[PDB]
């Protein structure tokens, strides 16, 4: 998907592995949180441990826990490419670690990723209506003119061009 970044969220950390110390028992606990962004998530999958089995309080070890940072951006159809009459169309994009700060509002970007339905909340009734996002696997800037690619032959050609006529090269 190609478009222009209209809004970026803040970069937030999302806990993927929390480590908890029990001062009463001296025990250390680790809990894993799997990435259920577009999967079904039962509530057992999202509980944060606060008590020991016999209700001793746990203290979370922040430095030992693992977080991955998470961002959401919205990509809009580029104004120069949108049909000149009507209102713009957008898509939401989830950026996860390594990809978060790659785009800022007003940037023209390609986002490669998986287009997916997000789960709604638990409920006994549903409209059949699903909220879709693009889960990025790659983000690249339009400025393929702001990053060059020099091979050994290119460098050699440049060096010879500069050495040959180092006087009227400017002209």
């Amino acid at each position: 998907v190609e478009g222009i970044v209209t809004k970026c969220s803040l970069v937030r950390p999302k806990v993927v592995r929390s480590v908890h110390y029990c001062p009463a028992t001296k025990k250390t606990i680790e809990r894993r949180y799997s990435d259920l962004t577009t999967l079904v998530a039962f509530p057992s999958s999202s509980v944060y441990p606060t008590k020991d089995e016999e209700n001793n309080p746990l203290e979370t070890e922040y430095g030992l826990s693992v977080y991955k940072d998470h961002q959401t951006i919205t990509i809009q159809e580029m104004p120069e490419k949108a049909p000149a009459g009507q209102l713009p169309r957008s898509v939401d994009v989830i950026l996860d670690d390594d990809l978060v700060d790659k785009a800022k509002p007003g940037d023209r970007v390609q986002v490669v990723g998986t287009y997916r339905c997000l789960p709604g909340k638990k409920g006994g009734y549903t409209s059949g209506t699903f909220r879709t996002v693009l889960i990025a696997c790659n983000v690249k800037q339009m400025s393929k003119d702001a990053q060059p690619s020099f091979s050994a032959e290119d460098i050699a050609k440049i060096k010879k061009f500069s050495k040959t006529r180092s006087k009227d090269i400017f002209d």
Partner: peptide, 13 residues
Amino acid sequence: ISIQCRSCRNTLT
């Protein structure tokens, strides 16, 4: 007695 919740596994000792 102590009872445990089937989903969140928290106990009510």
